Amino acid sequence: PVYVDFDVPADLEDDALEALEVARDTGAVKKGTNETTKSIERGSAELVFVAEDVQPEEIVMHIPELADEKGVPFIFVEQQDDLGHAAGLEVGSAAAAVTDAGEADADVEDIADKVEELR
């Protein structure tokens, strides 16, 4: 919420989470804030996911600004438990990155395009 500057409509979040599941199976994903952070810094991140229910906010709050200076686009998801499940985990995940979008690569670019429009 201090790190959240724009609102994502449920439909967008649905499409992004869907894209994430397919990118999981047909492509590469990083789960967890440390691995996500690494991929932004290493440049291998295509799309970055960040949950809004993260307590404390410290875990994830560096991500937007970091992603911005690495040119990596990012999207907000409401509950970390969905983000973790979408990424293939029994537990939640505060952040995730798509490294290889796989078959969802067309959809990823479009979701990126939709979010830049949310500014």
Partner: protein
Amino acid sequence: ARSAYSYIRDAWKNPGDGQLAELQWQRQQEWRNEGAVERIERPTRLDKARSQGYKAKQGVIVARVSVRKGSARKRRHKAGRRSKRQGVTRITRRKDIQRVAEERASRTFPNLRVLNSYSVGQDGRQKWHEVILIDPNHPAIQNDDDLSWICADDQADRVFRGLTGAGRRNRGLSGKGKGSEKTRPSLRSNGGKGK
């Protein structure tokens, strides 16, 4: 490359700047309405906690403790004293606020032992610390090669004997050289002159 953890660390170098400042200003509002000792499900500073031995695992517990700021809450002499001993206002306790916080947490959790603690900031009237405690009786701890030392009988009530990290620093044990003549091996064996 930088760990994500390094970002939490870096934020906390300046608690009155940037996003963290906003965070604190919001959070403290809730903290001031909370009790003396509050068990929290996750550490506010994850880097510091892991640095201090915290693991996300059964039998590891974190609690945030509020303690009043400033000097000794001290009653004035009720009988004869030489002038040197008549003070009230400027007298300060020999245990730092952090150790007070650690003792209050440990008392709240009589079965648990204090591993370590760290500062989460302060308002004008009080300071908050988060204290990591460990269940010495839980087999997830008893089998952890990194934490199982704390299960030994001689580690019972470690905080109250000054065996904690804040305990040891506050006892003047930091230096191995000059200045430590009256602290090591203990304040008491040196006749209470260490501080």
